[PDB]
């Protein structure tokens, strides 16, 4: 099982959109996938996946033994092979324990999940640290913007020193850059950091580039991840990303105008 | 001194943009203002205010007595009356500590202490609203952001120092941000009114989606300083309203 954390540091760059679209895309390709909301007290993954009303038990319920993984997992209705573990709604920072999260991830491997997508919250404090701690890979989600690039760099420092793999001299977390809300026209008028500017700063492998797309607002309005909209450019770029995660090369679209 | 927290729950809605534009606008109007970055381990306010390289000591340095408020405050160079207290960079913020800092700032005669809150409802965000007299709930016309703003209203009413002591409650204002009237009329975006019917609080500003905001952070120059930017003008309107002057809402129809 590949445990993939979708992280960023900066808030509102597209972690939820990406965690949802990518988990769905992987499911579509026949890979049994669960996407877990690691937020503390804010439930946004269920809202984007469109299952906000089937949420009975959540991640922290399972950790405190008030529910089984089976009781808390929500099987997506629209896409076969896809499951969602939603976030707790308590303000308690403790709630998510390292031992607790580990136990849940082992249960999921035992249930035969190939991909465990961890939708991280913003920050570098508790919920975000917990989402990357057991990761085998990290999708660093970034906008061509100054705050986001600075905060992604900080997150790279954490991936390299506070993850379980780093703290034990194991093979390090495999890192990928998901450059999101890109706008080639803005780049050429000199108003927006280009894809290459961002790579020269955060020096990691590009795994996708998601164009700014009016389809993404319409997708969350309906609770339908944007990869399911076969006309959306952001959807197509996410389906490319999924191919690259599965090992297939794909040319990068939507980087020139 | 009015302590104003800029809050949201949801990440990336415009808290930093709004905290910077509004602190600046207030300073421009001759009100001595400090804007404080309450983030834990991420420094974003200094980047948007353009003083990332003058940062020697930060908010947590002052709380742990490694520096004085005078050593950590950065006086803005471009706008008179404006000061920035930047965020710590450790992975600290105590209630007693933050209270001591806020009293020192009142004693230094600051009229407005703008608290630039982080995302979430955990530690840094709770600390930024706890001592507030007002809250600017920053919201996009989007489903995650409206849901998370509602949660933040619940906390403002129960976990703030005013709520926990039956004092006059925190005065709350909605700052609707990244609005797009054209998107609203094509039926693709929650309207200003949809958002008011749900989070039932007083509107204090509406900031349009504006390509000027990316250009402003690129330069480290708050968007209110760009006198041609619609987002800038809407933030100057907001500042007027905070100071008690009515102003008609622009950029809500197309």
């Amino acid at each position: 099982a590949r445990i993939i954390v979708v992280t960023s540091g900066k808030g509102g760059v597209g972690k939820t959109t990406s965690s949802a679209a990518i988990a769905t895309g992987l499911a579509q390709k026949g890979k049994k996938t669960v996407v877990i909301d690691f937020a503390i007290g804010l439930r946004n993954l269920d809202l984007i996946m469109g299952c906000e009303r089937r949420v009975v038990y959540d991640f922290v319920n399972v950790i405190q033994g008030d529910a089984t993984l089976n009781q808390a997992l929500i099987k997506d209705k629209r896409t076969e092979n896809l499951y969602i573990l939603p976030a707790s709604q308590t303000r308690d920072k403790d709630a998510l324990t390292r031992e607790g999260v580990a136990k849940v991830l082992d249960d999921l491997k035992a249930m035969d999940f190939e991909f465990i997508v961890c939708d991280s919250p913003a920050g570098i404090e508790t919920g975000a640290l917990m989402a990357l701690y057991f990761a085998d890979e990290a999708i660093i989600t970034t906008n061509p913007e100054v705050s986001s690039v600075r905060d992604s760099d900080r997150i790279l420092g954490i991936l390299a020193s506070k993850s379980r793999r780093a703290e034990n001299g194991e093979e390090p977390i495999k890192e990928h850059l998901l450059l999101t809300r890109y706008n080639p026209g803005r780049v050429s008028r000199g108003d927006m950091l280009s894809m290459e500017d961002v790579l020269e700063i955060l020096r990691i492998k590009l795994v996708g580039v998601i164009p700014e797309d009016q389809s993404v607002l319409r997708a969350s309005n309906q609770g339908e991840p944007v990869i399911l909209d076969i006309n959306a450019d952001a959807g197509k770029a996410y389906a490319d990303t999924v191919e690259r995660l599965l090992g297939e090369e794909r040319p990068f679209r939507f980087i020139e105008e | 001194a009015r302590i104003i927290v800029v809050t949201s729950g949801k990440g990336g809605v415009g808290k930093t943009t709004s905290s910077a534009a509004i602190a600046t606008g207030l300073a421009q109007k001759g009100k001595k203002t400090v804007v404080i970055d309450f983030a834990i381990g991420l420094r974003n306010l200094d980047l948007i205010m353009g003083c990332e390289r003058r940062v020697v000591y930060d908010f947590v340095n002052v709380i742990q007595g490694d520096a004085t408020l005078n050593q950590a405050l950065i006086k803005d160079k471009r706008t008179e009356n404006l000061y920035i207290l930047p965020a710590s960079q450790t992975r600290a913020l105590t209630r007693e500590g933050v209270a001591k800092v806020l009293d020192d700032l009142k004693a230094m005669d600051f009229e407005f202490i703008v608290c630039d809150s982080p995302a979430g409802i955990e530690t840094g965000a709770l600390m930024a609203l706890y001592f507030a007299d007002e809250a600017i709930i920053t919201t996009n016309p989007e489903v995650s952001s409206v849901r998370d703003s509602d949660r933040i209203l619940g906390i403002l009413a129960s976990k703030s120092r005013r709520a926990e002591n039956g004092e006059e409650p925190i005065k709350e204002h909605l700052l609707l941000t990244r609005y797009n009237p054209g998107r609203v009329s094509r039926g693709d975006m929650l309207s200003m009114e949809d958002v008011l019917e749900i989070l039932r609080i007083k509107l204090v500003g509406v900031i349009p989606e504006d390509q000027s905001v990316l250009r402003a952070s690129n330069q480290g120059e708050p968007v209110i300083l760009d006198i041609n930017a619609d987002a800038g003008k809407a933030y100057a309107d907001t500042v007027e309203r905070l100071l008690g002057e009515e102003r008609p809402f622009r950029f809500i129809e197309e």
């Binding site: 809202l47 906000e52 009303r53 607002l217 319409r218 969350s220 309005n221 309906q222 609770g223 | 489903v143 409206v146 849901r147 509602d150 609203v184 039926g187 693709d188 975006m189 929650l190 309207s191 949809d194 749900i198 989070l199």
Partner: peptide, 14 residues
């Protein structure tokens, strides 16, 4: 018209 769907889904939660 997805703004209307968004608004109904929102009211049920809040």
């Amino acid at each position: 018209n997805t703004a209307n769907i968004a608004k109904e889904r929102l009211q049920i939660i809040v």
